[PDB]
C-alpha cells in the first residue's frame, strides 16, 4: 500500500466547463480554455489510514468532532429528507457513534470539512487543488468528454466508478460492487493515473464558489477572490443520472467550508514533490 503517492500532471491547455451544460444552475457553462502548469496530484482520495497518521501526528480534532454532529445519508443508518445530522457521526464513526472505520482502513476519509482538508494537505507538505487543476486532472487527457474515461458510463460493459445503481434513494443495488464507499484504489485509473476522481467520495477544491464564468482564457486560475461556499467536485457513491448527475468532470457543487458529510472527502495536490 502506497496510498499517499502522487502522479505528475503534465502542463497543458484544456476546455474547462461545457457549452452543453447538463445542470445549468451550477454554472457548468460556458466552456473556457484554461492553461495549467505541470504539478502533482494524489492518485487516491485521502484514506482513513492516511488521515489517522495526520491525527496521530498532530492531535487534530475535526470540526464535526467539535460541533458534535455531521450529516449522514439515511440509507446507511438537511439539504434533503434523506440527510440527517447525526450526533457523534464523524470520520472515525461514519454512520454515527456505533459505527467504526476498523474494517475499512483503505476507504476515503469522510466527514472532513474544507478546513480539515486544508489542515491535512498542508500537514502533508501539500495543498488542495484548484477547481481548474482538479477538472483538468479528472479529464485525464481527453477533450470534452463526460467522464474521465470517455462518454459511455460502462465502457465495454465494465463499471468504471462507484456511484448509485437502482432507484435513488430507496434502493441501491450495489451492482458496481459497493453500496457505500470503496477502497481508494478501487476501479480503473484515468489516463493520468488517478483513481475515483468521479464517484466514491466528493472532493473539496480550494476555490470559492461562483456560477459566473467568463469565456476569457486564463492561466492557473484560482477562482473568485471571495465567497461563502467552497467548490467540491466529482460526485459520490450516491450519484445517479436521475437526481445527482455530478459524476462528470464538468460537474460542480458547493458547501460552506465548515460543512461535513458521509459522502464528502478530498485529495491533495502539490507544486513539487513533498
Ligand atoms: C495511530 O496511533 C495509534 C496509537 O498509538 C496506533 O495504534 C496503536 O499502535 C501500536 C503500535 O503499532 C499498537 O501496538 C497498538 O496496538 C495500537 N493501538 C490500537 C488502538 O490498536 C495506530 O497504528 C496509528 N495509526 C496510523 C495510521 O499510523
Ligand atoms: Ca456503488
Ligand atoms: Ca471521488
Curated annotation (Swiss-Prot):
Query: Domain of life, per the record?
Result: Eukaryota
Catalytic activity reads: L-cysteinyl-[sulfatase] + 2 a thiol + O2 = an organic disulfide + 3-oxo-L-alanyl-[sulfatase] + hydrogen sulfide + H2O + H(+)
What's any GO biological process attached to this entry?
A: glycosphingolipid catabolic process
* Compartment list: Endoplasmic reticulum lumen
Ligand binding (Cu(2+)) = 239, 244
The listed outcome for residue 82 to S is: In MSD; decreases its specific enzyme activity to less than 3%; does not affect localization of the protein in the endoplasmic reticulum of MSD fibroblasts; protein stability is almost comparable to wild-type
Keywords, A to Z, come to: Calcium, Copper, Disease variant, Disulfide bond, Endoplasmic reticulum, Glycoprotein, Ichthyosis, Leukodystrophy, Metachromatic leukodystrophy, Metal-binding, Mucopolysaccharidosis, Oxidoreductase, Signal
Q: Name one GO cellular component term.
A: endoplasmic reticulum lumen
What species is this protein from? Homo sapiens (Human)
Q: How is the cofactor bound?
A: The catalytic copper is required to activate oxygen and catalyze oxidative C-H activation.
Which residues bear sugar attachments? Answer: 56
Pathway(s) per entry: Protein modification; sulfatase oxidation
Protein name per the record = Formylglycine-generating enzyme
Q: Name one GO molecular function term.
A: cupric ion binding
- Which residues of the whole protein does the chain here span? 86 to 371 of 374
Q: Which family does it belong to?
A: Belongs to the sulfatase-modifying factor family.
Q: What is its EC number?
A: 1.8.3.7
| Cofactor(s) needed | Cu(2+)
Subunit comment for this entry? Monomer, homodimer and heterodimer with SUMF2.
Amino acid at each position: 500500500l502506497a496510498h499517499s503517492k502522487m502522479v505528475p500532471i503534465p502542463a497543458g491547455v484544456f476546455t474547462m466547463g461545457t457549452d452543453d451544460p447538463q445542470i445549468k444552475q451550477d454554472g457548468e457553462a460556458p466552456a473556457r480554455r484554461v492553461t495549467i502548469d505541470a504539478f502533482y496530484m494524489d492518485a487516491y482520495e485521502v484514506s482513513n489510514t492516511e488521515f489517522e497518521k495526520f491525527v496521530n501526528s498532530t492531535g487534530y480534532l475535526t470540526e464535526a468532532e467539535k460541533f458534535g454532529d455531521s450529516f449522514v445519508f439515511e440509507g446507511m443508518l438537511a439539504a434533503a429528507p434523506w440527510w440527517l445530522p447525526v450526533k457523534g457521526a464523524n470520520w472515525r464513526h461514519p454512520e454515527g457513534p456505533d459505527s467504526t472505520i476498523l474494517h475499512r482502513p483503505d476507504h476515503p476519509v469522510l466527514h472532513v470539512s474544507w478546513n480539515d482538508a486544508v489542515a491535512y494537505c498542508t500537514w502533508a507538505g501539500k495543498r488542495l487543488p484548484t477547481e481548474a487543476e482538479w477538472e483538468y486532472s479528472c479529464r485525464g487527457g481527453l477533450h470534452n468528454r463526460l467522464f474521465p474515461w470517455g462518454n459511455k458510463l460502462q465502457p465495454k460493459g465494465q463499471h468504471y466508478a462507484n456511484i448509485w445503481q437502482g432507484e435513488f434513494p430507496v434502493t441501491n443495488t450495489g451492482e458496481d460492487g459497493f453500496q457505500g464507499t470503496a477502497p481508494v484504489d478501487a476501479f480503473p485509473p484515468n489516463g493520468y493515473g488517478l483513481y475515483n476522481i468521479v464517484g466514491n467520495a466528493w472532493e473539496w477544491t480550494s476555490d470559492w464558489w461562483t456560477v459566473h464564468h467568463s469565456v476569457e482564457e486564463t492561466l492557473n486560475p484560482k477562482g473568485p477572490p471571495s465567497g461563502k461556499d467552497r467548490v467540491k467536485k466529482g460526485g459520490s457513491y450516491m450519484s445517479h443520472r436521475s437526481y445527482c448527475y455530478r459524476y462528470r468532470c464538468a460537474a460542480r457543487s458547493q458547501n460552506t467550508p465548515d460543512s461535513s458529510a458521509s459522502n464528502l472527502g478530498f485529495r491533495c495536490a502539490a507544486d513539487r514533490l513533498p
